[PDB]
């Protein structure tokens, strides 16, 4: 074979050292892969890494997407074709900060115990894998692709100590054709690296870590001395920024310092920069953070105060990396960055309007049940979820109380909002004066703010959304539900012919045109919470509290000519004009650094 | 037929006022049945109310047990040998400060939808009435017996509206050839009434409430009225007491208030008193009510502040109200109640000890899987049950943390108490500093203290006792469990020939000589937390938090003499001796 994993990594007999950046094709728009790529190459690194999200290609049971934005192959193929090797990290879990950490909504609905040696798991990732791995077998570099290795799991450490479920997925690469090396990777200390890694068997291991090389490298080697193993050092994911969370200020990290931690490990061994280009959550596949029994959701960018920001452009940080591989690894030759150009545009006017509730029956087919339903039950994975029942008002004033929900629940009766409750908040008493004759409408609308993508609350009872026990009215259970899915990947099915009320969850459409299209940052420091659209297009969530106030628009999800921005608004905000910059809009936060 | 309901009740041809009482015959130790109802007909009342407890009549899906303190045939013929009628109320679901509201706690572990009309339910209700009910019908009125009606689910208006459900139920007891009428209870508000009856459907319907009889059967007759039913006034749960909660005080109720209100129902209509007698919930089978996402665990006595006291004996609310009845309703011939009599034994001494760790193997048989089950799927309803797996140190100081578990979680590494966690507390980081070399035992002891009885939590998901998602160490879930259930129905395998050692979860043997066995209250006031046996038999739980420190002993669990008194003590606090006392001890509650 032409890459090996011995005392040293060889290729073609040659003492080999990895210089890799993490850019994830699924958070990348396909049009910036070969700039993101170029940008990679010119900084003398020679590897791209990147997670394969099963979220992303499964995402309906049996139901395969490999193409367009998820055309794993072609990011491959750039990535040859522009001389860089590739580290694939196609585990059914991938963590990062990224919905449910990889794994499809739909299989908390099975019979089976998700991330463990569960057969019932372990075929479900098999038919996966079936899918996915042959179409990367042909780019293993032994037959003639760029593919040097592959993960087993991700940081499982971190989560068990499963041995017989590491060794099932390792049997599953291997039976399905993976004949490369491959590796764990985990925190390097004693307890992450024994509950995560088969080096008993003989799997080749590395270490996630931010800084002190030296110092963790050791931890490292201690734990390969131990086990008379003689391999190379290799950091595979050497955090070099921090990702963010809603209403928490954003921390940035030193680009000299950072630029420093990662000339000590290349001093001793191997890298990579996670993140190298972080690009951009879109839609609803933010991922959630836990701290006991809280969630804290994560935001729509990804910059990750990595080395190219959101759009793709090159920081202080890549200039500085730039500067320490040019005096310290000069044998790596470089070549001159890349930047975009970005754009603005002043007062776009609202061109149309509909309520949610105007526009329901073209945009959600309603399924209707005596006992309410959960999300996934339901069969949607994302988005928002409406509740709706038909109730008499017993008495003057009634009390309501949605049992265990999540994460976000808006109450409407007869179209009049009610109450706003977000996650523990959730389950307070609500009351409310209904019709004096007949049948009230109560609405509910659930939004699902994104899974936790890792660790104790993996698997928590609140990671399945929407109302898990019901919805009480006086002392009772309510039942006769119809609930309307939403998505929301069916913009084209907004009927801005209908109505629209003030204070209600609402659709607002705004048009422009662009003789040349250009990154550019929709700016909603001024609306409340929901999502936008551009061309049909969900760009992700905003929310008031920031940090992030703007939503990232590459220049591909704009067209030459007429252009139309949708934006979901659920609290009632309502602006007559938008504007786009060319720089994001921040939220300053208390212990914030930039 | 003898009883029907019209525009009143009406018994052989006559208007017929309902004096009910409830007694619960599993509150009540059997010898005392007679005890307890014959002091209810001493009142002028003349009909008995009980509750049919599921979880006591299926221990085990289709294991059935109706002999011995279950003998609800054996209770209703007292009854009916003392002149009073019977009303049954054989919800598969009945509240009542019970266990899980009286559910089977092993319907947890299946695929239905419980307290609905979901046929996987409603077939497993079938599957008990198929038991129960054919023991009932012999013992209508119209059959020879003393049952004059019988209750349609429980309160379900303070629950559900699923009116399928409720025809569900009704069509059971039909086919199960229940003739006599059926009723529904729930409160006398509109919501309630609205949601628990199918009145539209003809079935009778009773009010529960604790005061204000004019106001609340206004708002029942109003209801009736706007049905068009011509139809008596009942309330089937007349609330003349409180029943009690681990760390909160007792609340009673002023006697002479408590008989006026009384007269206000019986000037207007029938009456169910709850709780005439209330007795005890031995072992493990209490209670729990909830506030928001907070179990409050209610305790072993069920004393009620009745008209009888926990042992049956009449209080001054069984007096007032017996003057009440002989002021006001004086055509209704009364009785001099009986009393029974109390002990006291000074300074029991111990006799012998042993911790749980050194008798597991005698009391349990382990289950050894990979992941951590949870106490119903291991086939256990109820009491404690031990987690146990072997791990080694990878740090000097490493953290613990239970992700998911309840009631109530002590931990301990190599036989050392490390930590004591109750409820919310659990998940809390733990801090420990073990063994330097190889692999120290983990051992968990998780405490199921009463399933919710009602309401929203019915079934929450933390329903289901034991540790739900499992047990980390640093970041990982730790793996290879064995599992210890220790419901503790078998004192008899505690093997005292064992070690004993400090701060561990231990049992405790004093043995002493009974002359004549007569009522009397075991203190528990210097013992931590647990449950205690007189031989063999399970009085209950004691916790020294109070307000109860002591546990009720009916004289029919004494033999004449030796007698063995076992207590099982978890917090490592307990007596070289115990003592015997003639009332109870209580503490005060701040």
Same mark, same amino acid.
């Given at each position: 074979?032409?890459?090996?994993?011995? *005392?040293?990594?060889?290729?073609?007999?040659?003492?080999?050292?990895?210089?890799?950046?993490?850019?994830?094709?699924?958070?990348?728009?396909?049009?910036?892969?070969?700039?993101?790529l170029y940008?990679l190459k010119?900084?003398?690194f020679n590897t791209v890494?990147?997670?394969?999200?099963?979220?992303?290609? @499964?995402?309906?049971?049996?139901?395969?997407?490999?193409?367009?934005?998820?055309?794993? @192959?072609? +990011?491959?193929?750039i990535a040859q074709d522009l001389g860089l090797y590739?580290?694939?990290?196609?585990?059914?879990?991938?963590?990062?900060?990224?919905?449910?950490?990889?794994?499809?909504?739909?299989?908390?609905?099975?019979?089976?115990?998700?991330?463990?040696?569960?057969?019932?798991?372990?075929?479900?990732?098999?038919?996966?894998?079936?899918?996915?791995?042959?179409?990367?077998?042909?780019?293993?570099?032994?037959?003639?692709?760029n593919?040097?290795?592959?993960?087993?799991?991700?940081?499982?450490?971190?989560?068990?100590?499963?041995?017989?479920?590491?060794?099932?997925?390792?049997?599953?690469?291997?039976?399905?054709?993976?004949?490369?090396?491959?590796?764990?990777?985990?925190?390097?200390?004693?307890?992450?690296?024994?509950? #995560?890694?088969?080096?008993?068997?003989?799997?080749?291991?590395?270490?996630?870590?931010?800084?002190?090389?030296?110092?963790?490298?050791?931890?490292?080697?201690?734990?390969? *001395?131990?086990?008379?193993?003689?391999?190379?050092?290799?950091? =595979?994911?050497?955090? *070099?920024?921090?990702?963010?969370?809603?209403?928490?200020?954003?921390?940035?990290?030193?680009?000299?310092?950072?630029?420093? !931690?990662?000339?000590?490990?290349?001093?001793?061994?191997?890298?990579?920069?996670? =993140?190298?280009?972080? /690009?951009?959550? +879109?839609?609803?596949?933010? /991922?959630?953070?836990?701290? /006991?029994?809280?969630?804290?959701?994560?935001?729509?960018?990804?910059?990750?105060?990595?080395?190219?920001?959101?759009?793709?452009?090159?920081?202080?940080?890549?200039?500085?990396?730039?500067?320490?591989?040019?005096?310290? +690894?000069?044998?790596?030759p470089?070549l001159?960055?890349?930047?975009?150009?970005? =754009?603005?545009?002043?007062?776009?006017?609202?061109?149309?309007?509909?309520?949610?509730?105007?526009?329901?029956?073209?945009?959600?087919?309603?399924?209707?049940?005596?006992?309410?339903?959960?999300?996934?039950?339901?069969?949607?994975?994302?988005?928002?979820?409406?509740?709706?029942?038909?109730?008499?008002?017993?008495?003057?004033?009634?009390?309501?109380?949605?049992?265990?929900?999540?994460?976000?629940?808006?109450?409407?009766?007869?179209?009049?909002?009610?109450?706003?409750?977000?996650?523990?908040?959730?389950?307070?008493?609500?009351?409310?004066? #209904?019709?004096?004759?007949?049948?009230?409408?109560?609405?509910?609308?659930?939004?699902?703010?994104?899974?936790?993508?890792?660790?104790?609350?993996?698997? !928590?009872?609140?990671?399945?959304?929407?109302?898990?026990?019901?919805?009480?009215?006086?002392?009772? +259970?309510?039942?006769?539900?119809?609930?309307?899915?939403?998505?929301?990947?069916?913009?084209?099915?907004?009927?801005?012919?209908?109505?629209?009320?003030?204070?209600?969850?609402?659709?607002?459409?705004?048009?422009?045109?662009?003789?040349?299209?250009?990154?550019?940052?929709?700016?909603?420091?001024?609306?409340?919470?929901?999502? !936008?659209?551009?061309?049909?297009?969900?760009?992700?969530?905003?929310?008031?509290?920031?940090?992030?106030?703007?939503?990232?628009?590459?220049?591909?999800?704009?067209?030459?000519?007429?252009?139309?921005?949708?934006?979901?608004?659920?609290?009632?905000?309502?602006?007559?004009?938008?504007?786009?910059?060319?720089?994001?809009?921040?939220?300053?936060?208390?212990?914030?650094?930039?």
């Open positions: 074979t032409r890459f090996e994993i011995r *005392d040293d990594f060889y290729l073609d007999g040659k003492s080999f050292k990895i210089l890799s950046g993490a850019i994830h094709y699924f958070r990348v728009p396909p049009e910036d892969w070969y700039h993101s940008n010119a900084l003398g890494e990147t997670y394969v999200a099963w979220n992303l290609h @499964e995402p309906c049971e049996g139901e395969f997407h490999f193409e367009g934005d998820l055309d794993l @192959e072609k +990011f491959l193929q590739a580290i694939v990290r196609p585990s059914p879990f991938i963590c990062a900060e990224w919905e449910f950490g990889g794994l499809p909504a739909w299989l908390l609905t099975k019979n089976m115990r998700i991330r463990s040696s569960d057969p019932a798991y372990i075929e479900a990732v098999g038919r996966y894998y079936d899918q996915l791995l042959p179409r990367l077998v042909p780019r293993l570099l032994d037959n003639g692709g593919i040097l290795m592959m993960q087993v799991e991700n940081e499982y450490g971190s989560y068990g100590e499963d041995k017989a479920y590491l060794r099932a997925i390792r049997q599953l690469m291997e039976e399905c054709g993976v004949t490369c090396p491959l590796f764990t990777s985990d925190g390097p200390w004693r307890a992450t690296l024994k509950a #995560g890694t088969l080096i008993e068997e003989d799997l080749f291991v590395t270490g996630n870590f931010g800084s002190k090389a030296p110092y963790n490298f050791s931890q490292m080697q201690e734990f390969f *001395d131990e086990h008379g193993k003689k391999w190379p050092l290799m950091c =595979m994911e050497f955090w *070099d920024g921090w990702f963010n969370r809603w209403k928490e200020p954003i921390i940035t990290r030193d680009p000299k310092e950072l630029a420093d !931690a990662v000339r000590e490990v290349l001093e001793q061994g191997s890298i990579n920069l996670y =993140m190298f280009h972080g /690009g951009t959550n +879109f839609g609803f596949m933010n /991922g959630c953070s836990a701290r /006991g029994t809280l969630d804290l959701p994560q935001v729509t960018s990804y910059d990750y105060d990595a080395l190219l920001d959101e759009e793709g452009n090159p920081t202080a940080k890549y200039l500085a990396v730039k500067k320490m591989m040019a005096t310290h +690894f000069s044998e790596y470089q001159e960055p890349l930047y975009k150009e970005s =754009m603005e545009l002043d007062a776009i006017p609202l061109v149309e309007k509909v309520s949610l509730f105007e526009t329901l029956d073209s945009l959600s087919s309603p399924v209707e049940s005596l006992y309410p339903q959960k999300m996934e039950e339901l069969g949607q994975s994302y988005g928002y979820l409406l509740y709706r029942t038909e109730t008499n008002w017993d008495a003057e004033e009634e009390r309501l109380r949605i049992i265990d929900g999540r994460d976000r629940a808006q109450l409407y009766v007869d179209g009049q909002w009610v109450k706003t409750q977000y996650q523990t908040e959730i389950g307070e008493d609500i009351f409310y004066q #209904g019709k004096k004759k007949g049948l009230s409408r109560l609405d509910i609308l659930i939004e699902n703010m994104g899974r936790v993508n890792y660790g104790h609350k993996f698997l !928590a009872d609140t990671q399945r959304k929407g109302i898990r026990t019901g919805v009480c009215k006086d002392l009772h +259970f309510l039942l006769n539900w119809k609930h309307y899915p939403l998505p929301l990947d069916n913009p084209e099915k907004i009927d801005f012919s209908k109505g629209w009320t003030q204070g209600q969850p609402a659709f607002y459409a705004y048009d422009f045109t662009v003789e040349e299209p250009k990154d550019t940052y929709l700016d909603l420091s001024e609306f409340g919470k929901g999502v !936008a659209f551009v061309n049909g297009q969900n760009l992700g969530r905003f929310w008031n509290v920031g940090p992030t106030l703007s939503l990232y628009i590459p220049h591909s999800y704009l067209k030459e000519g007429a252009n139309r921005i949708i934006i979901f608004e659920t609290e009632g905000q309502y602006k007559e004009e938008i504007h786009l910059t060319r720089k994001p809009t921040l939220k300053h936060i208390k212990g914030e650094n930039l």
